[PDB]
Amino acid sequence: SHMCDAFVGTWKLVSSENFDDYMKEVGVGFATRKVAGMAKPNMIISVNGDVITIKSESTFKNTEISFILGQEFDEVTADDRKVKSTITLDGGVLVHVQKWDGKSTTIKRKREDDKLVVECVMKGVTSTRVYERA
Numbered sequence: 075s076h077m078c079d080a081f082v083g084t085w086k087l088v089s090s091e092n093f094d095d096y097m098k099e100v101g102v103g104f105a106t107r108k109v110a111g112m113a114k115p116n117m118i119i120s121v122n123g124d125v126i127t128i129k130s131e132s133t134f135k136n137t138e139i140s141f142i143l144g145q146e147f148d149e150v151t152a153d154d155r156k157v158k159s160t161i162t163l164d165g166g167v168l169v170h171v172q173k174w175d176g177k178s179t180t181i182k183r184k185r186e187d188d189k190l191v192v193e194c195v196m197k198g199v200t201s202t203r204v205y206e207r208a
């Protein structure tokens with residue numbers, strides 16, 4: 075009931091920092107990094123009962139995940155990794171862990187002022203992506 079109210083909406087990328095390095099750390103190859111790094115995706119978040127859906131729509135790739143908090147699921151990432159993901163709420167932050175091939179990355183989505191701030195970490199490399207209402 076009302077868990078993710080402040081996340082619901084259509085969010086357009088307005089700034090990105092260190093995403094190319096993050097992608098390199100994750101194992102994305104050169105051509106994909108270049109093309110993905112140009113894109114300005116829309117992240118569309120909705121809730122129906124306990125089910126949260128997060129879609130990303132872009133010129134490069136479109137992605138979609140639906141999930142229940144705390145319940146592991148299969149995910150195909152934009153770079154075509156086949157991962158096992160779990161998303162929880164921790165102190166009002168959506169925390170998304172992706173596991174594949176013995177590796178792990180954590181993605182946090184936070185509401186800060188009128189923005190949605192997304193921090194992606196792979197080992198020592200952190201990237202920040204800022205999205206505003208579309």
Ligand SMILES: Clc1ccc2nc(N3CCCCC3)c(-c3nnn[nH]3)c(-c3ccccc3)c2c1
Pocket residue numbers: 087097102106107110111113114115116117130131132134135136151152153181192194203
């Ligand atoms: Cl190659 C590659 C590798 C990993 C990626 N992870 C992303 N996420 C950042 C937002 C939180 C979830 C993770 C995103 C993304 N999704 N929505 N906005 N950026 C992309 C991506 C998708 C479409 C167009 C450009 C970039 C992406 C691309």
